[PDB]
Amino acid sequence: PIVQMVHQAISPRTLNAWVKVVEEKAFSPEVIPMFSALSAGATPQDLNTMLNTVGGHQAAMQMLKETINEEAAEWDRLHPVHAGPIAPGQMREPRGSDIAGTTSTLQEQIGWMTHNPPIPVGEIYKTWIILGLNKIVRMYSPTSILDIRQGPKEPFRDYVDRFYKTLRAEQASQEVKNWMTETLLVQNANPDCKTILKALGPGATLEEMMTACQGV
Amino acid sequence: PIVQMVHQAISPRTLNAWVKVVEEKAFSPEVIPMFSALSAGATPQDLNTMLNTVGGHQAAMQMLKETINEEAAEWDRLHPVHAGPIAPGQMREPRGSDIAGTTSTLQEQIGWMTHNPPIPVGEIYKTWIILGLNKIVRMYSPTSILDIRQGPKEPFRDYVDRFYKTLRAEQASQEVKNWMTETLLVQNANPDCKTILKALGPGATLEEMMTACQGV
Amino acid sequence: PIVQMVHQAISPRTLNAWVKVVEEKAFSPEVIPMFSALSAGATPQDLNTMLNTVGGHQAAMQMLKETINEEAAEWDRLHPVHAGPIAPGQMREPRGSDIAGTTSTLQEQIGWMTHNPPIPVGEIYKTWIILGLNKIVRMYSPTSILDIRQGPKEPFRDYVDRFYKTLRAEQASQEVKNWMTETLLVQNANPDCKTILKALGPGATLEEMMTACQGV
Amino acid sequence: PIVQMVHQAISPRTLNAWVKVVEEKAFSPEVIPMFSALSAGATPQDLNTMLNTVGGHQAAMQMLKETINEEAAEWDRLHPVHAGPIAPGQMREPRGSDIAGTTSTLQEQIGWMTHNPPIPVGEIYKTWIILGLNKIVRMYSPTSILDIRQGPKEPFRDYVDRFYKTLRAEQASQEVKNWMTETLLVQNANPDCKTILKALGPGATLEEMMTACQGV
Amino acid sequence: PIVQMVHQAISPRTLNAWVKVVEEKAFSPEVIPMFSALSAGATPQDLNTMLNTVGGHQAAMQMLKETINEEAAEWDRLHPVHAGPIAPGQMREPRGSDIAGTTSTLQEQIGWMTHNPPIPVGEIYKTWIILGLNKIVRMYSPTSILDIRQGPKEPFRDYVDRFYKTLRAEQASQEVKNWMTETLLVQNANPDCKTILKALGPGATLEEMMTACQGV
Amino acid sequence: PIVQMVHQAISPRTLNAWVKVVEEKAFSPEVIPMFSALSAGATPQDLNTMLNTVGGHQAAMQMLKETINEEAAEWDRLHPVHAGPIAPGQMREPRGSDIAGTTSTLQEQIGWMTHNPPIPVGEIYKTWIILGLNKIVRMYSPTSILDIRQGPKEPFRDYVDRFYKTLRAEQASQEVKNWMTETLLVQNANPDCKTILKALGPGATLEEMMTACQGV
Ligand SMILES: [Cl-]
Ligand SMILES: [Cl-]
Ligand SMILES: [Cl-]
Ligand SMILES: [Cl-]
Ligand SMILES: [Cl-]
Ligand SMILES: [Cl-]
Ligand SMILES: [Cl-]
Ligand SMILES: [Cl-]
Ligand SMILES: [Cl-]
Ligand SMILES: [Cl-]
Ligand SMILES: [Cl-]
Ligand SMILES: [Cl-]
Ligand SMILES: [Cl-]
Ligand SMILES: [Cl-]
Ligand SMILES: [Cl-]
Ligand SMILES: [Cl-]
Ligand SMILES: [Cl-]
Ligand SMILES: [Cl-]
Ligand SMILES: [Cl-]
Ligand SMILES: [Cl-]
Ligand SMILES: [Cl-]
Ligand SMILES: [Cl-]
Ligand SMILES: [Cl-]
Ligand SMILES: [Cl-]
Ligand SMILES: [Cl-]
Ligand SMILES: [Cl-]
Ligand SMILES: [Cl-]
Ligand SMILES: [Cl-]
Ligand SMILES: [Cl-]
Ligand SMILES: [Cl-]
Ligand SMILES: [Cl-]
Ligand SMILES: [Cl-]
Ligand SMILES: [Cl-]
Ligand SMILES: [Cl-]
Ligand SMILES: [Cl-]
Ligand SMILES: [Cl-]
Ligand SMILES: [Cl-]
Ligand SMILES: [Cl-]
Ligand SMILES: [Cl-]
Ligand SMILES: [Cl-]
Ligand SMILES: [Cl-]
Ligand SMILES: [Cl-]
């Protein structure tokens, strides 16, 4: 990675942390923030290290590769490289495969990241990776938000935990998520809780909803 | 985080420590001081990393989101942003969502935290998070302080441990807590201890109370 | 903490070390030196972090709070704060609650600790905490030094281990401890060892006493 | 290793990480990226340390030695050393065995790596090692890509995981790998999935293929 | 400790390492080199931290205290402190209890250790501690070197391991140790090995002795 | 150790790593590269720390002592110390026991290692230690290379693993090792493999030999 500047290897602990996270949690949604934290200041070389150290899950890892290549091709369309000899005190313009670290060297990556103005190839590549990880989380989610229904003796808190877990795995925008919360949460609550939540009105906070259905 | 200045990634150990704390202790009151210690010098990006790495407990995490948004909206009311182009050698004034790290970049966060005078967005956001965590601790507390009663063969020390554990989870002010201690502790002690503690008078320290009921 | 100067967060390992020490050893006497080592260079904020991260033992932790408040009130009596506006290039004089970190900020704590001359608020607060921890160790000690008696088939080394373990938990001064050693150790040894130790005379070292009763 | 410059020992954690990786994963393909990450900035001395700390697998380790010697001999052919006394402020030209660290000293390795222009002997030797590791991965792969066939009740995702795991161990070029994907994946799918994938046409992404055969 | 200069706290890992060593190995001879390594650059405060963090073994720890006090009293005899006010840019001369860290402050310890010329109070105190630890190792050794005799079917290597383990715990000088090796090792070997070793003559190395009795 | 310069203590992790390596692997050949890596930049004091922290194996550790003394005596013969007072800005010439760290101080060791020109006493002593460790590995090897014979149903890969494991423990030169490989490997293979390997001719690589006998 790079930190406030200087380059260094990914630490053994960071490497092991990532490998173990994937071994333990597969593609539960919280893996993505963990990936992002473990890859802080990463060069594309470091990001490829992290992805290539995953054994198994090779369908997911292939899907990620295809997503990356799609984003790289889009970058190339928007940023076509201009022909000419690179001047003294200048860097060549990166293509998509340079950002993804397959056709660039570490020095070139360092060159772009530490240039003035900077070309943050590590952060660009990370956005592409996270887009691909989000697709995998979606695909690997066992359940739909439409099927989350409170059981007749289920504590409301447990139902809400299942609701918001499933909502998190959905790849719908924030406005759609708001509609899901406003509509389904109360609609798919059990008869007694549902009646109590409708009495609160559509202005209630989750805290107030949870407090209301505690006794039920 | 930032430390005496320079920015760096949250360490794998810090990340793992937080994840494991939540896995093991859920929302026992001591989790909050642990959160605060693990988030020392944190930018809002780092604070979101910590909260987003939690898998499960998504009712609690949603309640926390709602608390954050409430505090952000209050900030916006008290600190309305003034229209105009930002001068050379100046930072734009942060709105609530900039403090909570959803509409600001890391450089902007670094910019505010290291400015002269500083705008400590990390510490402001942390106060909002801790307010939300305190609400969750309250809500998830199984017991009321009014129901803590010493058993007829219960060592006074064990009763006092249960009393002060339950008191800690109550979200009443320090003056109310003082009344609880002065009134209930002795009132809800078992017959023999209760008689002995009333004989000490209302000036006794906890040490003296504990020593008095040792033999009982 | 602060180290030779610069401030930084308490490390996750330090935090975990302290939590685990308390989980494992409760209030055995060796916990106090461990506390002191783990809190080296600590600000009052860091010291409160350490104490607040303890879950359970809330009778002990309340006793500690009361001890701290007693020491803070004594500080206030000896060091009454003088009214007036604080000059440029000067620090306000700390009251007891500033030393204990409940009414002071981290910058103010840093301000006092790094001032010339220094006001070591962290070390002052640590002495108060250790006074309180010593009271808890005393109170939680199961045994009195007067009751430590060598069994008729007990190796002298095992008896001496029990003697000095119990002596360590007593909160009597060094002169009283010397009397206990000079008087009780030999007095409460078993018949055969006791006779052998009285023959050595009152000038014998512990090494010589232990060697003498090896064969017994 | 060397990091942005300064030399230092390989850390105990790096050493242990490598030893344990080999103990646990043998020569699964992901071991190679792990080797590369753990050997970041390595001198040839450090690389030999890593390889020599492996106990067991001595057939593989001998094959690696032979691969290294082959690459060293090729280097010598392409870069024959010129006779003459080495000038003040100059380094002798490295032969293959100097790059592999058997006839050079640590200072000489440091000398080449930190020279202007640099002669990155660590990175050259690492390419040779990885060539040898790739040969071992190939040789130790239990299965051929031609034999990966979806079972009649096998989830398509599981079949794809096995396909891309086996493909990764093949030491065929990227163009051959593309042919394998375009031809075999669909060809060796089970009757019902195979029919569904042929209906998608040869433009489908893996995501689309996986989604199509979810219900099957 | 102090390292090339700057002071810092003993690390949690160092603390834990020492505690665990004592828990696991008690007073086997190798504990002393481990103590010495873990206490590298230690101030007397750090050395007391290490000794005071030991729970149990309080007979041994008391014997150590008595040994320390004996060495402190000897220091005082050889180095009597001269009366007078300490000059600007000068340090007071340490007494035995200042070296052992009970009557000196950390700053004073730092003062002596970093003075020109240095007064290495940490290293002086460490020699006293190691003298005391050696006495404990001796006292706690279960066996005498005179009783180590090779069994009639015991591999010579196992006998030699027991011999040199027991020899290490003896607190006799190097010349006495040489006599023990030259005399007893061969004398207390089993009949067949003993005959073979006497045939080698008194010039044989241990390697040659071990090789000679391999087949036996 | 010393690192690019500055001196510091051996880390607790390094110490523990070495102790555990010896506990787990005894004197398997890979222990020596591990020793060398863990002792990088070591002073003789640090090297003695590492050797003295070993509990048990005291026959081996005595053999190592004798090997060290032999090398020290050889050093003394080749480098006799010249009588005279040591000049300002000069170091006394080290004798063998100064190199082995028994008659020199840490400052003197630092003095030699950081002098211009340097006298690398740590690296010299390390060569002596490794010579002694190699003697122990030889002596403790259970098997001879002449006795490694492929079983009639043994996979060739398993036979080759045993061959090269045993070869590694032999203390014969590289030319002798080459003869062993060229002669014995094929000679001591099982009837069917042996016939197949003789058909390849004496130019075959190990990879080619292993591939040839895969089906057998
Ligand atoms: Cl995995
Ligand atoms: Cl998953
Ligand atoms: Cl890679
Ligand atoms: Cl790869
Ligand atoms: Cl850009
Ligand atoms: Cl970047
Ligand atoms: Cl569900
Ligand atoms: Cl969780
Ligand atoms: Cl909870
Ligand atoms: Cl995040
Ligand atoms: Cl998230
Ligand atoms: Cl502000
Ligand atoms: Cl802040
Ligand atoms: Cl309770
Ligand atoms: Cl606890
Ligand atoms: Cl206790
Ligand atoms: Cl706190
Ligand atoms: Cl708290
Ligand atoms: Cl003061
Ligand atoms: Cl302080
Ligand atoms: Cl007892
Ligand atoms: Cl292995
Ligand atoms: Cl393998
Ligand atoms: Cl090596
Ligand atoms: Cl080797
Ligand atoms: Cl080159
Ligand atoms: Cl290199
Ligand atoms: Cl398969
Ligand atoms: Cl212990
Ligand atoms: Cl012992
Ligand atoms: Cl202490
Ligand atoms: Cl103590
Ligand atoms: Cl001195
Ligand atoms: Cl010192
Ligand atoms: Cl024995
Ligand atoms: Cl051992
Ligand atoms: Cl062995
Ligand atoms: Cl030592
Ligand atoms: Cl030793
Ligand atoms: Cl030399
Ligand atoms: Cl050296
Ligand atoms: Cl074998």
Automatic annotation (TrEMBL), chains A, B, C, D, E, F:
<keyword id="KW-0472">Membrane</keyword>
<keyword id="KW-1043">Host membrane</keyword>
<feature type="binding site">
    <location>
        <position position="13"/>
    </location>
    <ligand>
        <name>ATP</name>
    </ligand>
</feature>
<keyword id="KW-1035">Host cytoplasm</keyword>
<keyword id="KW-0519">Myristate</keyword>
<keyword id="KW-0946">Virion</keyword>
<keyword id="KW-0449">Lipoprotein</keyword>
<dbReference type="GO" id="GO:0020002">
    <property type="term" value="C:host cell plasma membrane"/>
</dbReference>
<feature type="disulfide bond">
    <location>
        <begin position="193"/>
        <end position="213"/>
    </location>
</feature>
<keyword id="KW-1039">Host endosome</keyword>
<dbReference type="GO" id="GO:0055036">
    <property type="term" value="C:virion membrane"/>
</dbReference>
<dbReference type="GO" id="GO:0042025">
    <property type="term" value="C:host cell nucleus"/>
</dbReference>
<keyword id="KW-0862">Zinc</keyword>
<dbReference type="GO" id="GO:0072494">
    <property type="term" value="C:host multivesicular body"/>
</dbReference>
<keyword id="KW-1188">Viral release from host cell</keyword>
<keyword id="KW-0694">RNA-binding</keyword>
<keyword id="KW-0167">Capsid protein</keyword>
<keyword id="KW-0543">Viral nucleoprotein</keyword>
<keyword id="KW-0597">Phosphoprotein</keyword>
<keyword id="KW-1048">Host nucleus</keyword>
<keyword id="KW-0677">Repeat</keyword>
<dbReference type="GO" id="GO:0008270">
    <property type="term" value="F:zinc ion binding"/>
</dbReference>
<keyword id="KW-0863">Zinc-finger</keyword>
<keyword id="KW-0067">ATP-binding</keyword>
<dbReference type="GO" id="GO:0003723">
    <property type="term" value="F:RNA binding"/>
</dbReference>
<keyword id="KW-0479">Metal-binding</keyword>
<protein>
    <recommendedName>
        <fullName>Gag polyprotein</fullName>
    </recommendedName>
</protein>
<dbReference type="GO" id="GO:0019013">
    <property type="term" value="C:viral nucleocapsid"/>
</dbReference>
<keyword id="KW-1032">Host cell membrane</keyword>
<dbReference type="GO" id="GO:0005198">
    <property type="term" value="F:structural molecule activity"/>
</dbReference>
<keyword id="KW-0547">Nucleotide-binding</keyword>
<keyword id="KW-0945">Host-virus interaction</keyword>
<dbReference type="GO" id="GO:0075523">
    <property type="term" value="P:viral translational frameshifting"/>
</dbReference>
<dbReference type="GO" id="GO:0005524">
    <property type="term" value="F:ATP binding"/>
</dbReference>
